[PDB]
């Protein structure tokens, strides 16, 4: 009986492949070979945010484009004023193994987690004047790879147990459990409309999920190795994945397949972060070759390079106002570029 | 800056001060990962070490032997990304074993990991009394051209076993600090301390070019 279901799955996979081929009439490169080159984009280090005692694993911006949260193997979570290189806060964590950080879209909360299995949500706005653990969301079996906020009351997480989860913060229960990955889920990104989100998961696949339904809407593949980064094109109908095979890629949700692949022959190093600029013309990819490259997102060309980290660029993020790009590396330095 | 930014800068300077305090505390703290299928050996060594130097998932252990902060992590391809500020790896392997194949497969996996390239490796061999007990009633492993001496004195058996963990290593120049371990704990702590010290000396000199 099992062979029947397996063969039906194979037939459906063939239908999916054929339908994706049938829509691939022309590529983004054949359409943008006539558009103006983005040029020699070389922006500088404006701020060098230093103070962490070890490697930074995650950074996240505020919606105000000024405040910045960073989680480090120190067991610390520092909130910085990017304009002035001030430390707004230092949050000591119960576990030194923090892999992700989030900054609430309203600025009230931050989040962290890691090999401690538990998603820790911190309240910044207390009359007691201290950041305190507002909740410890429990329910994951492995490490917490990335955590993202929708509003102040609910948060989406992904773990190293092949499982994502939409938590209601007040009650601490998984209001929805997103299952379907076959590997460790590493990086997830939310749509700006905050109704869909995608997950990348060390199984050569990323998935578009609906948050209000709990079902995996679409399954994208094409990578040969672990999708270690993900981010939406800033309108919610394209995203880009970086992976240990040293290749970024751009997927369109409506076309359900790739559009343009960003790989250079001299880059044999893995990809640790991906982000888009405000308009989506620039694609920033942090690499393990101690570097971060800037891609013309519509031509697969290299616009430029943010050289200037002394070890792996583990995180990067672009402000909501577009002014700055902030990169965090395992050299304890977080740098603002504009 | 004016009248609120000066105060914010004072706050940030205080946070920098606290972070520098903890860097002073941390940069002295050396990490020794623990691995191996000998869970009982892991527990026994942990208990003895904490008894001397104190007086689920990952199970950290903090103590201080000779004024030197040890963090025995006691743990997988993603976990090890977080573990390259480490100064050694221990394997708890029971000398009385088959289980030697299993242990050396695990050691082969761990020993050559790229993230652990600059990490010295200590192979803690456990229950050597049980090893001589199984030498008296010879347990013969006949799957390698090393049975020559197998039904003989314990020393040949130990040499074969220690080679078996020397076997399956592909990144040498940082030697395996093999020990033959018993129930006395002071010598165990001494082994750990001496191995970590030699590792740091060699790294300092090699990176200072002698």
């Amino acid at each position, epitope marked *: 009986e099992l062979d029947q279901l397996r063969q039906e799955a194979e037939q459906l996979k063939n239908q999916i492949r054929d339908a994706r081929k049938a829509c691939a009439d022309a590529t983004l490169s054949q359409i943008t070979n006539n558009i103006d080159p983005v040029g020699r984009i070389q922006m500088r280090t404006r701020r060098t945010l230093r103070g962490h005692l070890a490697k930074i694993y995650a950074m996240h911006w505020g919606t105000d484009s000024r405040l910045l949260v960073s989680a480090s193997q120190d067991g610390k979570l520092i909130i910085w004023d990017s304009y002035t290189t001030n430390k707004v806060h230092a949050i000591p964590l119960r576990s030194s193994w923090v892999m992700t950080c989030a900054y609430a879209p309203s600025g009230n909360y931050v989040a962290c987690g890691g090999l401690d299995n538990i998603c820790s949500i911190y309240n910044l706005k207390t*009359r*007691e*004047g201290n950041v305190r653990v507002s909740r410890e969301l429990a329910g994951h079996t492995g490490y917490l790879s990335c955590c993202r906020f929708l509003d102040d009351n609910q948060i989406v997480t992904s773990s190293g147990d092949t499982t994502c989860a939409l938590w209601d913060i007040e009650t601490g229960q998984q209001t929805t459990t997103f299952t379907g990955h076959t590997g460790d889920v590493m990086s997830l990104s939310l749509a700006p409309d905050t109704r869909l989100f995608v997950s990348g998961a060390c199984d050569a696949s990323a998935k578009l999920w609906d948050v209000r339904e709990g079902m995996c809407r679409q399954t994208f593949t094409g990578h040969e190795s672990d999708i270690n980064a993900i981010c939406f094109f800033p309108n919610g109908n394209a995203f880009a994945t970086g992976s240990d095979d040293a290749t970024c890629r751009l997927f369109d949700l409506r076309a359900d397949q790739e559009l343009m692949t960003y790989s250079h022959d001299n880059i044999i190093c893995g990809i640790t972060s991906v982000s888009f600029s405000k308009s989506g013309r620039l694609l920033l990819a942090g690499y393990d070759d101690f570097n971060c490259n800037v891609w013309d997102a519509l031509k697969a060309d290299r616009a430029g390079v943010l050289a200037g980290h002394d070890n792996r660029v583990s995180c990067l993020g672009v402000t909501d106002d577009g002014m700055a790009v902030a990169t965090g590396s395992w050299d304890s330095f977080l740098k603002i570029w504009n | 800056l004016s*009248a609120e930014d000066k105060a914010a800068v004072e706050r940030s300077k205080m946070i920098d001060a606290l972070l520098a305090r903890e860097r002073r505390a941390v940069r002295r703290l050396v990490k020794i990962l623990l691995l191996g299928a000998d869970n009982s050996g892991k527990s026994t060594f942990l208990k003895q070490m904490r008894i001397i130097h104190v007086n689920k998932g990952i199970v950290e252990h903090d103590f201080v032997i000779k004024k030197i902060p040890f963090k025995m992590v006691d743990v997988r391809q993603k976990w090890f990304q977080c573990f390259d500020g480490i100064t050694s790896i221990l394997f708890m392997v029971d000398s009385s074993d088959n289980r030697l194949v299993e242990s050396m497969n695990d050691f082969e996996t761990i020993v050559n990991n790229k993230l652990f390239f600059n990490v010295s490796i200590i192979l803690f061999l456990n229950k050597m009394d049980l090893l001589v007990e199984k030498v008296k009633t010879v347990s013969i492993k006949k799957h390698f051209p090393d049975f020559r001496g197998d039904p003989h004195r314990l020393e040949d058996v130990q040499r074969y076993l220690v080679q078996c963990f020397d076997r399956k290593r592909r990144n040498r120049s940082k030697p395996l600090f093999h020990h033959f371990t018993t129930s006395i704990d002071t010598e165990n702590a001494r082994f750990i301390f001496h191995a970590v010290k030699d590792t740091i000396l060699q790294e300092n000199l090699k990176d200072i070019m002698l």
Partner: single-chain antibody, 231 residues
Framework: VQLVESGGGLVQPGGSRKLSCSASGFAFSSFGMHWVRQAPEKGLEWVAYISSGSGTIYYADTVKGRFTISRDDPKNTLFLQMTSLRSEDTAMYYCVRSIYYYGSSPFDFWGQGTTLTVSADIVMTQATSSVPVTPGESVSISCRSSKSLLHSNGNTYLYWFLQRPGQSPQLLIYRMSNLASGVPDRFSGSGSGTAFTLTISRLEAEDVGVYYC?????????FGAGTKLEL
């Protein structure tokens, strides 16, 4: 949160006194502390300030080297050592919490205060001492600034405070535009450098009282006379 102040009473002219402030329910060592005066029938004046970490200390012109502010963090106590008091020091003193990071709300919690009886600077002018008002109608108050409060940072460091009859002041607007936590949203404020106005839609009972304006552009902090809203 709670700041219970102790040390009041009657002092003969001259002499010395030591006001203490017991903080309870918040992380004292992360906060700045201000000492704020209020004359028996008058507006409220600023006195002194100690920072988080006791790093910096600021005073008014009438108390410099005459008063000393200190904090003992482990016991959660703020001290004001008053030396050589005069008949003009007769006032109610309040301990005013403050915190300074991007987006913080300084001057947020004001203590119950202690009564002490003794037997250039940015000028801010209150438009009028009192206003006839009626519940349900929107009202406006104003002060004038002798010096543009819009610092180059873009923030206009101006504060509006409310003291109900017989109670301790409550922050109402910080930096000329933002509302404090616990304040109804019917309060709002606006203005620019050298003139600013507070607007209330649907003033009700318990909105009676005195509205004060402070500058925080540069110590010393100077206060207006405050307008009284009377039903």
């Amino acid at each position: 949160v709670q700041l219970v102040e102790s040390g009041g009473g009657l002092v003969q002219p001259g002499g010395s006194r030591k006001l203490s402030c017991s903080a309870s329910g918040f992380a004292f060592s992360s906060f700045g502390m201000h000492w704020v005066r209020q004359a028996p029938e008058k507006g409220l004046e600023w006195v002194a300030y100690i920072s988080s970490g006791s790093g910096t200390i600021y005073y008014a012109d009438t108390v410099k080297g005459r008063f000393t502010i200190s904090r003992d963090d482990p016991k959660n106590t703020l001290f004001l050592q008053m030396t050589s008091l005069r008949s003009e020091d007769t006032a109610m003193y309040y301990c005013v919490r403050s915190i300074y990071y991007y987006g913080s709300s300084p001057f947020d919690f004001w203590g119950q205060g202690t009564t002490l009886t003794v037997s250039a600077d940015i000028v801010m002018t209150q438009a009028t001492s009192s206003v006839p008002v009626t519940p349900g109608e929107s009202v406006s108050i104003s002060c004038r600034s002798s010096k543009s409060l819009l610092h180059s940072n873009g923030n206009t460091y101006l504060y509006w405070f409310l003291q109900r009859p017989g109670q301790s002041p409550q922050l109402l607007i910080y930096r000329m535009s933002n509302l404090a936590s616990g304040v109804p949203d019917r309060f709002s404020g606006s203005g620019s450098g050298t003139a600013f106005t507070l607007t209330i839609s649907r003033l009700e009972a318990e909105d009676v009282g005195v509205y004060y304006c402070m500058q925080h552009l540069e110590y010393p902090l100077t206060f207006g006379a405050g307008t009284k809203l009377e039903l």
